[PDB]
């Protein structure tokens, strides 16, 4: 049974330095199995630097939960958004490379990211 922390790595982590990326990664990381996710962000940093965010700036998630954290620094990311004619099971993404703060919700001890909220 995949843990939430491991799913976060599968959905959100690609430490390698980076217009088709999103289309290719959403398919290949097996993220479009059940429905098209409307947005999904990949983070191009070490896993450690991402897990570190859980001890950086405590913020509210968009939904109002308060166990979210914003990276003190911006991070290299790819933002993937549904575009054009995307329709399950044929999902379609627009790719945008950026440098933005990430906001994650953290759970557990060890306290690690379990949900990617937004990039700002």
């Amino acid at each position: 049974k995949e843990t939430a922390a491991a799913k976060f790595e599968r959905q959100h982590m690609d430490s390698s330095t980076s217009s088709n990326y999103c289309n290719q990664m959403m398919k290949s990381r097996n993220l479009t199995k059940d429905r098209c996710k409307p947005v999904n962000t990949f983070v191009h940093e070490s896993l450690a630097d991402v897990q570190a965010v859980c001890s950086q700036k405590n913020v509210a998630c968009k939904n109002g939960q308060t166990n979210c954290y914003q990276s003190y620094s911006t991070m290299s990311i790819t933002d993937c958004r549904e575009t054009g004619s995307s329709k399950y099971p044929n999902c379609a993404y627009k790719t945008t490379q950026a440098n933005k703060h990430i906001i994650v919700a953290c759970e557990g001890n060890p306290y690690v990211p379990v949900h990617f909220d937004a990039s700002v």
Epitope: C54, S55, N58, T66, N67, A105, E107, G108, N109, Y111
Partner: nanobody, 120 residues
């Protein structure tokens, strides 16, 4: 410094104690801070938590009317005033910060634990 440090606690009778906890070196507000306990024989449970900006205060049903939580304004310090104490309040108490409401798994930043043993 950055880590939470608890004080107070120990032996008490059916009766009063005041626990305190500070993370003075964490240099932003922790949105939620609160207290959890693990009573002998029982899963850890949240006892009280309070938001930094008016977003809410919460008590476990079993302590309503007996315990009162408070926080310093804009310093990461949280207090638990414990009155009307019962033997079943015996427990290791823990300060927590940076999580949401009374959800143990959402808190990853903890004090060191404080034993409270309530006698007849």
């Amino acid at each position: 410094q950055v880590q939470l440090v608890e004080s107070g606690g120990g032996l008490v009778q059916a009766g009063s104690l005041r626990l305190s906890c500070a993370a003075s070196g964490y240099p932003h507000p922790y949105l939620h801070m609160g207290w959890f306990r693990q009573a002998p024989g029982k899963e850890r449970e949240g006892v009280a938590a309070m938001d930094s900006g008016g977003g809410g205060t919460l008590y476990a049903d079993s302590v309503k009317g007996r315990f009162t939580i408070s926080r310093d304004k804009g310093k990461n310090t949280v207090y638990l005033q414990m009155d009307s104490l019962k033997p079943e309040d015996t427990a290791t108490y823990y300060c927590a910060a940076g999580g949401y409401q009374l959800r143990d798994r959402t808190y990853g930043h903890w004090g060191q634990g404080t034993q409270v043993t309530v006698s007849s």
